[PDB]
Amino acid sequence: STEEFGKILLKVNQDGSRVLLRDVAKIELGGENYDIIAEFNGQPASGLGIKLATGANALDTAAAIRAELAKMEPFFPSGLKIVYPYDTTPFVKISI
Amino acid sequence: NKFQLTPVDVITAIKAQNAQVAAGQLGGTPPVKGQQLNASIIAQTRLTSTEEFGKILLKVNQDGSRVLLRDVAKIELGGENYDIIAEFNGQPASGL
Amino acid sequence: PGADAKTVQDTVTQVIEQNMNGIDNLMYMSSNSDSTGTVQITLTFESGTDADIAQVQVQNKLQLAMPLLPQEVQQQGVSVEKSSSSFLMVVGVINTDGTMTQEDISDYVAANMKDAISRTSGVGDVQLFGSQYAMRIWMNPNEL
Amino acid sequence: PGADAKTVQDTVTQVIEQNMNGIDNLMYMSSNSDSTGTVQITLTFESGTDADIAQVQVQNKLQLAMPLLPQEVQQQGVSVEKSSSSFLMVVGVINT
Amino acid sequence: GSDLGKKLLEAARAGRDDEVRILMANGADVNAADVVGWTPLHLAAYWGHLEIVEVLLKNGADVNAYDTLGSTPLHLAAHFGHLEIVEVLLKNGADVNAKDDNGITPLHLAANRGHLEIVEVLLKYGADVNAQDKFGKTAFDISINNGNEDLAEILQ
Amino acid sequence: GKKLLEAARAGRDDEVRILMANGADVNAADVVGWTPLHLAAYWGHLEIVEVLLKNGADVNAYDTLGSTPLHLAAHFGHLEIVEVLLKNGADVNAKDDNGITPLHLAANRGHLEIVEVLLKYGADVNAQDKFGKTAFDISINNGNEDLAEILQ
Amino acid sequence: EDTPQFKIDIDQEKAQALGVSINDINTTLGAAWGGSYVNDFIDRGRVKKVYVMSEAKYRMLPDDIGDWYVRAADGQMVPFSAFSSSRWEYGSPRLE
Amino acid sequence: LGTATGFDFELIDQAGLGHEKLTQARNQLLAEAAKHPDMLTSVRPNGLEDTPQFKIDIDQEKAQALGVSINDINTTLGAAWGGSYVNDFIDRGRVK
Amino acid sequence: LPAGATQERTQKVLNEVTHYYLTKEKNNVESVFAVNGFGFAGRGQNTGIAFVSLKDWADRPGEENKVEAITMRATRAFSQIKDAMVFAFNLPAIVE
Amino acid sequence: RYNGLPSMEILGQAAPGKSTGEAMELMEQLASKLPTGVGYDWTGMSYQ
Ligand SMILES: COc1cccc2c1C(=O)c1c(O)c3c(c(O)c1C2=O)C[C@@](O)(C(=O)CO)C[C@@H]3O[C@H]1C[C@H](N)[C@H](O)[C@H](C)O1
Ligand SMILES: COc1cccc2c1C(=O)c1c(O)c3c(c(O)c1C2=O)C[C@@](O)(C(=O)CO)C[C@@H]3O[C@H]1C[C@H](N)[C@H](O)[C@H](C)O1
Ligand SMILES: CCCCCCCCCCCCO[C@@H]1O[C@H](CO)[C@@H](O[C@H]2O[C@H](CO)[C@@H](O)[C@H](O)[C@H]2O)[C@H](O)[C@H]1O
């Protein structure tokens, strides 16, 4: 927790006062990096960009992805929802 | 010996002064919003020549006299190893 | 992390490239070294090459370079993937009650969804559009 | 050596598991982390999978995760083996 | 330490109220202790089994039993946030100021974990706010080190 | 203005006119405080340097680190540009925020012709940087004797 | 296209004179302006990373460089401005 | 093949619940199963129950005041009580 | 965007791209998933990408409502965006 | 752990005269009533 990091003890002063991490730093949960920020139709989003392994079947892999996604949904925090903004596979199915 | 140094000091100085440093950025993410400038910070880069290696600073003396790497060694480009020497009809050669 | 293009190239990219030899069916190799501190080296093979073996061969060579890479690069995890360059699909995640910010959603995806997707057969590579949470210690030079 | 189940789980097991991506024909994966200081992760593949390819793909993903593991674990080494439960025979050696 | 002692330790830890009831009827030693010195009451206090705590105390359990490191059931109840167990133990004579071998008290433990209600109950029952552990720390020292502003107020 | 900064860097000689002939600020400065003259000087665009100075470019403009176009020309061995700037009144002894002069820079990179010019214009050989170094100290540390003899 | 980058030279002589180690300088510059992955922690049961870095408002401007202090072997706090110099130059953000 | 009639079930922490809550969920499921002797028999955990362990807290402040390093404290405890693999030697020709 | 451009200015341009799809292509565009900081490989403050999903073919009768005319109109409109390269395009029948 | 998540394996068997499918159907039923955030899966012989 941030609280536990906050109380890491950097040093004890001469007068016996303590210097804790929180005294020399702000402590927070935050991204490993802050470079990628996505939106979906203008609202805050995240997501996964998926690429096919070399030679794999696109349609089977997509079905496997969805099946794995369905296992996750029932445990979503309230309000969380999956959206499907870009998929190259429906065209294959539909064109055939 | 005359300068009271060893290969350890030489090796240490070369690691310290022939270095390529990841130094971060100005205006990198997450930035203070309104930041106009984003720029890499460039610190030490690998040396590129005998001369640069020659002027590596081993130490300054009590009297401000300087001891450079070229004062304790010859600096030159030369084989990683000197074990293999080829000739083509008696003439100096290399090959694959 | 924190490295400029040139530092990445001369400390990582060249080191890996010089070790890329004795690989069957290699047509060509290209790389980008950028000031985000990122390197990508792409080895492209003859049509009909077995991607499994191509990957095995590349990594046998990468492993000779690994010890020579900066410790910070090794700890970020270098990866070797065999995938198409284009996206198969993008799975988006939103919150309809707007009670999770973009950062929260991204962490949820990183911590709870991405690993299982990444392990799914046929999934060559997964890019997170966001970042997993880390413990951030934001130092104050004045206090220090 | 000397590690408890949680220490094993949180410094080795989770790290290895998080790197088991991009491997072909995985059905499922399971693991035990225990207070003898031991971890075993078992990855089970579709029937018909080439066992040698399965093993080398796992071993290669592990190889890239080794630098994330504790020193004392890198030093002990991490074995990737094919699972079997059938012995041809067990030869005992005793002193009488 | 007996057939029934062992079963009582198990049943108390698992929160099996019916089993405990039957064991009480049969004379299962309420004072059975395991290797680390935990009694069924320790187990019940740790795992938050309120009914079993009450049944044990009605059957002559030692409310101030201590383990091999000097910790009591109240220590455990206070540390793990079991408010009503804490109340019951104190109703039944639990020593509000018991010090384990580290000189740590139930107050130190509740403080450390930010269990405000438990802290207040403890003070209510005469918890010594100025008690120091082996390191000279009080519950107030703990709260400012944790940065728990509220608890630090309570402890003025 | 921003168009001028770009044209000067790319060495687009005409373009520099079309803009110089439409009154683009000749001393437009970018985020690091570089003027079109800094850029032409840095990328060795001699003609553009001359055109800019013709149209009244500040010859001693300085960036956010105290550096002038002369610093740049001298450092990258652009001998002619160095001459022109000096002609047009470039402070030969300009110091950046580090106390570093065009002579320090030219001496560091062993530019002999350039060093001469700067001296032929009154460069203070005794000028010290923030670390107390002169060009001579540099030429010595570098083991450049041709240059060392000159500075004496 | 190439872009402005901030070039900083560490003065070896001066650092030796002050007794500030080159490793402390580069770690201070790198961690502050680039961020440093220190080690892992556990967030809600999952292994995740810990990063140290300067708070954004202290790594936005060139003059901020001098607000960072390194400790010398003699215990003295020494600002970056005492042992470095800097200049603008051009460099590539992406080398092919 | 296990047994026919046999099944092999995994209960899973899908939401960062932690070990204790997973345990309670498990017990809840085991008690219910036991209420269906007509359908289910010998429904049980394949793993191990929690056990007493000895928690020792290093006081960072006291160690710092006494001038004792955490590394020394931690390797002293681990080496002595858990054992430590130092390095290799050669016994009658074999590395051990 | 050119290197040196900020995340903030990249977002402004992404907002303009998103705006055009949500207002000028109402009848053809179902969704837009826009990502700031990620582009056709790799990361960067100065790059981004929009994935666009069209309504079903049956609701887009006419050459003018197909991907070719759509992406051509978009690219033309986006040409009037300052200090950025913004290109809308259909992925080719085949990769190489 | 199972599939990278904390887990606990549970073994058992169908009662006499009962199919494993029946036993499994019930286990799933029972599992549907567990505290929020607890899921399940079938592995090994049951997976097949
Ligand atoms: C008939 O092809 C073209 C004709 C005119 C212009 C273009 C192209 C073109 O193919 C093209 C690209 O393929 C790419 C880009 C691009 O601008 C163009 C054209 O302008 C942009 C890009 O390089 C990025 O900057 C990603 O961040 C990504 C992408 O590169 C792809 C293919 C590249 N060659 C690269 O080597 C890699 C395979 O990804
Ligand atoms: C593995 O392929 C890619 C992977 C990543 C990015 C890319 C591509 C890619 O193929 C690509 C392009 O082919 C094109 C462009 C592009 O950005 C990319 C990628 O980013 C942009 C473009 O319009 C220009 O930049 C022109 O200056 C030209 C071109 O459009 C193509 C297709 C159009 N519909 C039309 O046929 C045009 C003539 O060429
Ligand atoms: C008298 C013969 C008429 C058809 C007989 C076909 C029998 C079995 C066909 C197998 C596949 C059917 O697929 C056929 O095309 C698509 C499938 O994506 C369906 O529906 C389609 O409607 C519109 C256009 O018509 C498409 O934009 C849409 O994407 C698609 O869903 C059709 O309603 C279905 O008839």
Distance CA J8, CA J5 (A): 10
Distance CA B16, CA G22 (A): 7
The CA radius of gyration of chain A, in Å to the nearest whole number, is 23
Tell me which residue of F47, F8, F39, F38 sits closest to F24, measured CA to CA.
F8
* Whether A and G touch (3+ CB pairs < 8 Å), yes or no: yes
H or E segment to which residue E31 belongs: none
CA of I40 to the centre of ligand 1 (A): 8
Whether the link from the prior residue into H83 is cis, omega within 30° of 0, is: no
Cβ of D29 within 8 Å of Cβ of C55? The answer is: no
Sign for the CA dihedral angle at J12, J16, J21, J22 comes to negative
A49 CA to chain B: closest CA distance, Å? 22
> Ligand 3 atom 14: the closest Cα is on which residue?
A94
Residue type, G81: S
Q: Which residue has tokens 């790059």? A: I47
Q: A37-40 and A43-52 as β-strands: parallel, antiparallel, unpaired? A: antiparallel
**Residues A37 and C102 sit within 8 Å (Cβ to Cβ):** yes
CB C128 within 8 A of CB A48: yes
Q: Where on the phi/psi map is residue H17: left (φ > 0), alpha (ψ -120 to 50), or beta? A: alpha
> In chain F, which residues are last before a break of more than 2.5 Å from C to the next N?
none
Phi, psi of C14 (to 5 degrees): -65, -40
CATH number of the CATH domain containing F12: 1.25.40.20
Label each residue of chain A as H, E or C.
CHHHHHCCEEEECCCCCEEEHHHHEEEEEEECCCCCEEEECCEEEEEEEEEEECCCCHHHHHHHHHHHHHHHHHHCCCCEEEEEEEECHHHHHHHC
Between CA G27 and CA G32 the distance in angstroms is 8
β-partners of residue I29 are I54
Q: What is the CATH number of the domain that holds G65?
A: 3.30.2090.10
What atom of ligand 3 comes closest to residue I58's alpha carbon? Answer: 27
Distance in Å, CA I57 to ligand 3 centroid: 12
User: Which chain G residues are closer than 8 Å to A32 by Cβ?
Assistant: 49, 51
User: How many CB atoms are closer than 10 A to CB E76?
Assistant: 25
Integer Cα distance of J16 and A4 in angstroms? 54
From chain H, pick out residues whose CB is under 8 angstroms from the CB of J39: 11-12, 14
Task: Retrieve residue E153's tokens.
Answer: 């107020």
Query: What is the sign, positive or negative, of the torsion defined by CA atoms of B80, B85, B86, B92?
Result: positive
Dihedral-angle region of residue E90 (phi above 0 means left; psi in -120 to 50 means alpha; beta otherwise): alpha
Q: Does B44 touch chain C (CB under 8 A)?
A: no
Contact I96, I18 (CB under 8 A): no
Task: Please list, in sequence order, all residues whose beta carbon lies within 8 angstroms of the beta carbon of residue I76, skipping any fewer than 6 positions away.
Answer: none
CATH architecture type of domain I1-96: 2-Layer Sandwich (3.30)
> Which chain C residue's Cα is nearest to A83?
C92
Cα(I1) to ligand 2 centroid in Å equals 16
Those residues of chain I whose CB sits closer than 8 Å to some CB in chain A are 7, 11, 14, 18, 22, 31-38, 43-45, 51-53, 91
CA of A7 to nearest chain B CA: how many angstroms apart? 25
- Residue D44 CA to residue D54 CA, distance in Å, equals 9
Q: What residues of chain E lie within 8 A of the CB of A20, using their CB?
A: 145
* d(CA D54, nearest CA chain C) in Å: 10
CA distance F6 to A68: 52
Delimit the domains of chain I by residue range: 1-96
Name residues whose C-beta falls within 8 Å of residue F66's C-beta, 6 or more positions apart in sequence. Answer: F95, F96, F97, F98
Instruction: Name the residue of chain A whose CA is nearest to J36's CA.
Output: A75
Burial label, B15 (beta-carbon count in 10 A; 0-12, 13-18, 19+): exposed
Residues in contact with B90: Cβ distance below 8 Å, sequence separation at least 6, in sequence order: none
Q: Which chains have at least 3 CB atom pairs separated by less than 8 Å from chain F?
A: B, G
SS (H, E, C) chain C: CCCCHHHHHHHHHHHHHCCCCCCCCEEEEEEEEECCCCEEEEEEECCCCCHHHHHHHHHHHHHHHHHHCCHHHHHHCCCCCCECCCCCEEEEEEECCCCCCHHHHHHHHHHHCHHHHHCCCCEEEEEECCCCEEEEEEECCCCC
Dist. CA H6–CA J23, nearest whole Å: 9
Please state which CATH number belongs to domain C1-83: 3.30.70.1430
Q: Which tokens in the block code for residue A10?
A: 């950097």
Amino acid at F30: D
Residues 27-56 of G with CB under 8 A from C: 30-38, 41, 43-44, 46, 48-56
Which strand (E) or helix (H) includes residue D45?
Answer: strand D38-45
Q: Which residues in chain H have Cβ-Cβ distances shorter than 8 Å to C111?
A: 16
Tell me whether residues F31 and B36 touch, CB distance under 8 A.
Answer: yes
Alpha-carbon gap, residue F61 to F25, rounded angstroms: 13
Cβ-defined contact of C92 to I33 (cutoff 8 Å): yes
Distance CA E53, CA E42 (A): 9
Q: Radius of gyration of chain C from Cα atoms?
A: 19
Question: Which two tokens mark C89?
Answer: 């699909």
Residues forming a β-bridge with A25: C139
Q: Inter-axis angle of helices I67-78 and I7-24, to 10 degrees? A: 130
Residues belonging to chain E: 156
Q: How many CB pairs lie under 8 A apart between chains B and C?
A: 27
Residue E23 burial (CB < 10 Å; 0-12/13-18/19+)? buried
Residue D81 CA to residue D87 CA, distance in Å, equals: 15
Residue D5 DSSP SS3: helix
CA atoms within 13 A of residue C43's CA, in its CB half-sphere: 25
Angle, in degrees to the nearest 10, between helices E50-58 and E17-26: 10
Spatial contact of C135 and G48, defined as CB atoms under 8 Å apart: yes
| Region for residue G24 given its phi and psi (left: phi exceeds 0; alpha: psi -120 to 50; beta: otherwise) | alpha
Which burial class, exposed, middle or buried, applies to E35 when counting CB atoms under 10 A from its CB (0-12, 13-18, 19+)? exposed
**Residue C82, both tokens:** 């065999």
Residue range(s) defining the domain that contains residue E114:
1-156
Residue nearest atom 19 of ligand 2, based on CA coordinates: I40
Report the alpha-carbon distance of residue C83 to residue E131 in Å, rounded. 64
Mutate to test the pocket of ligand 2, among C32, C42, C85, C90 (most ligand atoms within 8 A of CB): C85
Beta carbons of E110 and E118 less than 8 angstroms apart? yes
Residue G96 lies in a domain: no
Does H25 contact J33 at a Cβ distance shorter than 8 Å? no
Decide: F and E in contact? Rule: 3+ Cβ pairs under 8 Å. Answer: no
CB contact under 8 A, H7 and J46: yes
N-term to C-term CA, chain C: 23
Our CA dihedral for E128, E132, E133, E134, rounded to 10 degrees, sits at -150
- Determine which of C115, C119, C120 to mutate to test the interface with D (most D C-beta atoms within 10 Å): C119
Structure tokens at E79: 């540390």
Would you state the structure tokens that stand for residue F50, as one six-digit string? 């001359």
Mutation test of ligand 2: which of I89, I90, I95 has the most ligand atoms closer than 8 Å to its C-beta? I89
Name the method of structure determination: X-ray
- Residue in G closest to I42 by C-alpha: G94
Pair B14, B56: CB distance under 8 Å: yes
* Total count of domains within chain E: 1
Range of the domain at G86: 3-91
Helix axis angle for H19-33 and J20-31, nearest 10°, is 130
Separation of CA F70 and ligand 3 centre (Å): 74
Q: Which of D22, D24, D68 sits opposite C75 (nearest CB)?
A: D68
B neighbours by CB contacts (3+ pairs under 8 Å): A, C, F, G, I
* Contact (Cβ atoms closer than 8 angstroms) between residue G90 and residue F30: no
Ligand 3 atom 31, closest CA: A94
Q: Residues B58, B68: contact at Cβ < 8 Å? A: yes
**What dotted CATH number matches B1-82?**
3.30.2090.10
**β-strands A43-52, C123-128 pairing:** antiparallel
Ligand 3 centroid, distance to I66 Cα (angstroms): 19
Amino acid sitting at position C5: A
Substitution target in J18, J30, J36 with the highest count of H β-carbons within 10 Å is J30
Closest of A9, B58, A26 to residue G12, by C-alpha: B58
Give residue for tokens 């190239």.
C9
Ligand 3 mutation target, pool A87, A89, A93, A94, most atoms within 8 A of CB: A94
CB I68 within 8 A of CB I90: yes
